[PDB]
């Protein structure tokens, strides 16, 4: 059916095409793998300009029609989903592999038999790493904090953020400690509001121990800040999801008014009814009101006179963070108030911003709440929007370290240990699986080599050194002098990649290969 507008590919060409298509996607992003990497301006068809060293993000934005690329688009994506840092690299390794696989094919090898070869050599490397890796959690407490940081830092060196990487790193380290527990080892990112606004530089990007939100503070006359109300236990605040307006049904209405009788009673009904709420909150003994939905002109004024700063309209996730931040309860009706369901926050101020007529507000807490707000700032949108994703990247590497305190020293060395170990087992293999193992390990070598290429070092050169040194001594961790400094040895240099991620990466590529190779037939149609 639909015979026309339908093409077919199969091996002679086909495989070349695919292999090459991968390779080419790669050639673009290879120049972004490294602490010497570079970003790529991507533009939405609408006109949105972005700038980012993030792998996944780049390949998602490249509006591309080649089917194989479409696959590497997800390859970098899936990895971003599972870890949060692989992206830029997972594809590189994948391509290299493909070129390698292809190469063998023109020497008489079966595509599917290479597949099994790679899957095997891979599983081995994963092990030769799973054995050489080091542990952090089980070693110290002040050193865990350090190592956990020394990763977040290394994880940021390939970003514009790099400039102030000290702060951005210690920020990501903190942001995670404060919302996940050593036992559950679960970092729920809903407990971390990644909000950013413009202004200053990326340096003025602090971490807030509460939340932000945008509010003018209901009535203008209202105060700007909020003290702990004399000797009290910090500040108490109302967290209600009921509107400061006369209660209404939820089924019908038609309050039939026969005569001036009842209309006379409604009259005074709404009137004091506003006092029925304004009083209600005073009774629970609170300082400031945070209502999910707006208030009436009357009800507002009262909140003024009664020194009850208010917050008209606050979104779901919004109101909710104000709870968990201040330890309060989300109170339905008005009469459901009480001094014991209030929010025990530590301060509230209406934050100014340059001359921007916006001027949002903030809710602090002093002590590490169960909610953090990394509030990012920058000289221009793109710097921010990149710095936020840059922050995110690190925050993820911090989450992976609690979910698996295992660490491997990157700098390319992590990939050299495999290439070394996997290549050894090659000589023992002999025959066909010999070519596979050699290949797998050989593709790997492109990872460090690429780092050398970007940092300005002769590839073959740094590789022989990295291989020799990491053999003439111990299948340890000797990385590339990516920036300079004394010499190799990612350890001293403090270059660290979480193991858990590295495994995922060196899998996701081989697997993706294992799929493409099995494809020997293709049938594309058009858009009728």
């Amino acid at each position: 059916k639909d015979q026309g507008n339908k093409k077919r590919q199969h091996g002679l060409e086909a495989k070349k095409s695919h292999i090459l298509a991968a390779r080419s996607v790669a050639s673009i992003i290879k120049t972004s793998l490294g602490p010497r990497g570079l970003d790529k301006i991507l533009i939405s068809p609408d006109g949105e300009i972005t700038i980012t060293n993030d792998g996944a993000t780049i390949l998602s934005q490249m509006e591309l029609d080649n089917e194989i690329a479409k696959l590497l688009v997800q390859l970098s994506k899936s990895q971003d989903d599972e870890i949060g840092d692989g992206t830029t690299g997972v594809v590189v390794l994948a391509s290299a592999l493909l070129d390698q696989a292809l190469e063998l094919i023109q020497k008489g090898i079966h595509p599917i038999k290479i597949a099994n070869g790679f899957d095997e050599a891979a599983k081995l490397a994963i092990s030769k790493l799973e054995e050489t890796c080091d542990d952090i959690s089980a070693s110290n407490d002040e050193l865990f904090r350090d190592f956990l940081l020394r990763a977040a830092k290394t994880s940021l060196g390939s970003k514009i953020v790099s400039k102030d990487h000290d702060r951005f790193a210690e920020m990501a380290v903190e942001a995670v400690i404060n919302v996940m527990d050593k036992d559950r080892k679960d970092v729920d990112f809903d407990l971390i509001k990644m909000q950013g606004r413009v202004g200053g530089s990326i340096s003025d990007s602090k971490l807030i121990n509460g939340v932000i939100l945008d509010k003018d503070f209901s009535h203008p006359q209202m105060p700007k800040c909020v003290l702990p109300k004399e000797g009290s236990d910090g500040v108490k605040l109302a967290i209600l999801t009921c509107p400061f307006e006369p209660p209404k049904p939820k089924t019908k209405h038609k309050l039939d008014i026969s005569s001036v009788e009842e209309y006379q009673k409604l009259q005074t009904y709404e009137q004091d009814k506003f006092k029925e709420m304004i009083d209600d909150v005073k009774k629970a003994g609170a300082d400031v009101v945070i209502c999910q939905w707006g208030f009436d002109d009357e009800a507002n004024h009262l909140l003024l006179q009664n020194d009850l700063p208010a917050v008209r309209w606050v979104g779901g996730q919004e109101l909710e963070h104000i709870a968990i931040s201040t330890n309060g309860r989300i109170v339905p009706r008005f009469q459901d108030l009480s001094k014991d369901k209030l929010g025990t926050c530590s301060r509230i101020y209406e934050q100014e911003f340059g001359t921007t007529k916006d001027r949002m507000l903030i809710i602090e807490q002093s002590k590490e709440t169960k909610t953090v707000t990394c509030f990012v700032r920058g000289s221009n949108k793109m710097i921010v929007d990149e710095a936020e994703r840059a922050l995110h990247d690190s925050l993820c590497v911090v989450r992976n370290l609690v979910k698996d305190s295992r660490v491997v020293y990157g700098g390319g060395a992590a990939e050299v240990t495999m290439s070394l170990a996997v290549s050894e087992e090659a000589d023992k293999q002999r025959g066909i699986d010999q070519y596979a193992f050699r290949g797998f390990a050989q593709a790997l070598d492109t990872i460090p080599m690429t780092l050398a290429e970007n940092s300005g070092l002769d590839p073959i050169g740094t590789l022989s050194t990295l291989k020799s040194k990491q053999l003439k001594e111990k299948i340890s961790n000797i990385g590339v002098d990516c920036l300079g400094y004394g010499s190799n040895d990612m350890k001293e240099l403090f270059v660290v990649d979480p193991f858990i991620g590295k495994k995922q990466q060196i899998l996701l590529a081989t697997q993706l290969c294992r799929m493409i190779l099995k494809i020997d037939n293709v049938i594309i149609s058009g858009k009728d």
Partner: protein, 519 residues
């Protein structure tokens, strides 16, 4: 000047029958590569724009559109094969086609088709009985209860993207055919879930049940996200203030009545609400919503919830914690609820997943699948359904045959030998079908590279000269006892295959005039 059909094509003649054959051959040759352990795979990008990659011959022949009447039957018999069996779909067509191919010589030489149809008819009958005759029934005949389901889910999981991670999935596959009552094997219980990302084997086998995270409301984040033995309340409907739907009219002439009816609404909810609290539950699920206020409530008193649960999910939820759906909050008795061994809200593949793991009293599991691309997870789910469905039909029929071309090659033997006793027209036709079966062994070798000619021919000697299970040593390219090598598949495949395949073949050989109407 008059007409009889209004410009609407329609061909007839002897060529008509030959056109149709060749037509089918195409759709046939198409799948031939996806056969055997070392089988090639396809990548179809339908006019839809959805890109897929698979081996379920059914799934391929479903994406080819195909409109040729004749050649379109190969699409049908391939679908049925993925039904009454679940596997072999690739092959039903290779054969179905191949026969039509071997019918050409006769049809050309000038022989009736009704005679070729008869000839093939017997050929199947004999061939079908022969399989039944070899269907090695066992139970503890040095096979064990698990080693049958494993040994069979394995060989069948071969030649699929899921191969080199075999062990992991066969142990997973069998475990999930057993998860449900072995008295009524219903697939609809093994409900699968796909999760973006992860290794194509970092997949998880939930013992109880796992489902999305429809939890779309404020006030969450409170409510523990983990319980050991919680008191699951598999409730069916509502839990919102104003109600999610349905209403009536409230007309009042008294100011007090207004505020009165209000206080009533509230209490009307809260009651039904505490009515749940009263059941003393830790987990409250409902196929309908759980409003902001509602979920907020349980949140206060450390009770977890989720609104708008997938319909086909609550049913697997019941079967896991052994609850029992309840529509109202009134007569909620305790044998109605359920309890698992452990509940948690994971962050698998950057997606929160509520899951009731550990449930020694379940009759329904759930399993999350992983992959680096929405195409691979997709192929796993189909590569696994082809296995699960074969394990299932291997409980109900502990009768198995060694494929890898053996069963096929042997059924040829007895069929070719038989034809000697017939002589004449029926001889060639029935002897043809015999040779026509050689396509599976034949193709299986070409796909992988083995010397298709020699390995085939060498097999015919030994197999006909004894060894009723000689097939092909996927390993050292050479013939071998596939029963000994443990390449097992239920006989239920082959028997359905040759029945249903031939059907197509004679359905085509029966048509002499094809009248396509235009419009």
């Amino acid at each position: 000047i008059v007409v009889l059909k209004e410009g609407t094509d329609a061909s007839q003649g002897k060529g008509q029958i030959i056109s149709n054959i060749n037509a089918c051959v195409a759709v046939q040759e198409a799948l031939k590569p996806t056969l055997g352990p070392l089988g090639s795979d396809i990548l179809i990008v339908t006019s839809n724009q959805k890109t897929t990659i698979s081996n379920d011959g059914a799934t391929i022949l479903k994406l080819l559109d195909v409109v040729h009447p004749a050649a379109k039957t190969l699409v049908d018999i391939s679908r049925a094969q993925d039904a009454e069996v679940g596997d072999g779909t690739t092959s039903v067509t290779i054969l179905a086609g191949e026969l039509m191919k071997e019918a050409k010589p006769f049809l050309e030489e000038g022989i009736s088709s009704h005679l070729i149809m008869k000839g093939y008819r017997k050929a199947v009958s004999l061939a079908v009985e022969k399989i039944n005759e070899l269907a090695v029934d066992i139970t503890s005949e040095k096979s064990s209860g698990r080693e049958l389901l494993e040994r069979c889910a394995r060989t069948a999981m071969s030649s699929k993207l899921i191969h080199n991670n075999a062990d992991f999935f066969v142990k997973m596959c069998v475990d999930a055919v057993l998860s449900l009552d072995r008295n009524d094997l219903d697939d609809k219980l093994i409900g699968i879930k796909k999760i973006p990302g992860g290794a194509m084997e970092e997949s998880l086998f939930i013992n109880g049940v796992a489902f999305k995270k429809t939890f779309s409301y404020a006030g969450f984040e409170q409510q523990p996200k983990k319980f050991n033995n919680p008191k699951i309340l598999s409730l069916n409907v509502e839990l919102e203030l104003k109600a999610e739907k349905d209403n009536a009219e409230v007309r009042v002439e008294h100011v007090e009545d207004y505020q009165a009816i209000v206080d009533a609404e509230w209490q009307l909810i809260f009651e039904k609400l505490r009515q749940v609290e009263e059941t003393g539950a830790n987990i409250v699920l409902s196929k309908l919503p759980i409003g902001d206020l509602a979920t907020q409530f349980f949140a206060d008193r450390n009770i977890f919830c989720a609104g708008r649960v997938s319909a086909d999910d609550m049913n697997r939820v019941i079967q896991a914690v052994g609850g029992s759906i309840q529509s109202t909050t009134s007569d909620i008795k305790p044998e109605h609820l359920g309890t698992c061994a452990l509940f948690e809200e994971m962050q698998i593949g950057s997606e929160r997943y509520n899951l009731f793991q550990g449930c020694p009293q379940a009759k329904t599991c759930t399993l999350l699948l992983r992959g680096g691309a929405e195409q691979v997870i997709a192929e796993v789910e189909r590569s696994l359904h082809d296995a699960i469905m074969i394990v299932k039909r291997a409980l109900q029929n502990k009768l198995i045959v060694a494929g890898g071309g053996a069963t096929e090659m042997e059924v040829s033997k007895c069929l070719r030998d038989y034809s000697k006793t017939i002589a004449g027209k029926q001889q060639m036709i029935i002897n043809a079908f015999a040779k026509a079966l050689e396509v599976i062994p034949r193709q299986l070798c070409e796909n992988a590279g083995f010397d298709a000619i020699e390995i085939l021919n060498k097999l015919r000697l030994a197999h006909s000269k004894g060894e009723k299970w000689y097939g092909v040593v996927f390993e050292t390219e050479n013939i071998g006892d596939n029963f000994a090598k443990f390449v097992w598949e239920p006989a239920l495949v082959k028997i359905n295959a040759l029945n249903s395949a031939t059907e197509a073949t004679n359905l085509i050989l029966s048509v002499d005039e094809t009248i396509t109407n235009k419009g």
